[model samples]
Target: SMNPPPPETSNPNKPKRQTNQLQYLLRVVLKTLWKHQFAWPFQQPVDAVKLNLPDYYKIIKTPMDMGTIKKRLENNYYWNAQECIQDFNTMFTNCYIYNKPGDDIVLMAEALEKLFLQKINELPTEE
Candidate 1:
């Protein structure tokens, strides 16, 4: 017969997990975009001057459209760390200029934790 595992006690001296600032910011940007339904307007021409986004950050074509952006976030297709960082900075800059409230930033950190966990699960295991 198998014995049940013993109950665990909390450790006051347990070390806290380290956080990556860029990933936290990326999660914030993605959640804010999803919450505000911010991508719809990107389907049309965006006013870079009004939105405070740089001209180079503008999405002028179909693949960069709202649907594609949403798909990329949902599918974790950021591909590389640099792409993730760039998108996060672009979104964060625009959102900050628009004066989005601060509460979502906390939620962003939580979402980022989940994202990192998922990525870790996808890594190949060595023998």
Candidate 2:
């Protein structure tokens, strides 16, 4: 998310500590992004909210044909990767300071990245 810590003072141990921290941080960041991101899975029918329709159909209580609507809506989707990363940077910059390396924040970033990739792959080939 946010930048990793600045390089430390000339203490001999500082470099080792920073390396360990960065490794931990990188894992945390990736997992967190994977969790929060929205990923569309494989091709499947989707339900959509039905809006305006003919009055005659209202009385029949028929289920609206939502698959096409869902496809149409999905076709208009936007991927704001930069925005998502910015949000993660802002929200979870200090997550490691407060939470343990094994906590939610760590796994979250990796999970978020996985989800993001899944979404990219699921998109229609035309995209």
Candidate 3:
């Protein structure tokens, strides 16, 4: 009868962290863009390091070759609108599997999408 109750340990009043759904959606979109070829050209320089990732993830870091990406964008090689849209769709699917902070991705994705769309529009179309 002398056994004392377990020491008080639980804190029920602690505030729960809330995640924004929009931010999550944005992250997914950004990741998808990367996964698809649409955003591949806009990735960071080839030599850049992803220091933000965990050690295990860091080992696989491989930034795209900036020069090659620039060449592809400048050469009008991606002239098909349907292919571009397909790439975007592919990226969206790939983004679902990606895990990262969303804020930065969303900002970068918006800028890149706008820039690339403009570039694509300027490409010559077949008569």
TM-score of each: 0.29, 0.23, 0.33
Residue ranges of candidate 2 with Cα displaced over 4 Å: 1-81, 117-127
- lDDT-better candidate, 2 vs 3: 3
Backbone clash pairs in model 3 (N, Cα, C under 3 Å; residues 3+ apart or in different chains), count: 3
lDDT (Cα) of model 3: 0.37
Model 2, residue 92: distance off in Å is 3.9
On lDDT, the leading prediction is 1
Question: What TM-score does structure 2 among the candidates reach?
Answer: 0.23
lDDT of 3 by residue, 1-127 (tens): 1222322222345322212322322244334445654454345432222433333224322223223333333333333434334444333333323335375644455555665455445444433
Which pairs in model 1 have colliding backbones?
none
lDDT of 3 at 21: 24
Model 3 vs truth, CA RMSD: 19.9
Please rank every candidate by lDDT, starting with the best. 1, 3, 2
List lDDT for all candidates, in order. Answer: 0.40, 0.32, 0.37
Whole-model lDDT, candidate 2?
A: 0.32
Per residue, candidate 1 scores C-alpha lDDT tens digits across 39-95 of: 445333344555554533333221132333444444455444445445434443443
lDDT of 2 by residue, 10-80 (tens): 23332222232233223443343323433121111111223232332223222211222223223321123
Superposed Cα deviation of residue 85, candidate 3 (Å): 9.3
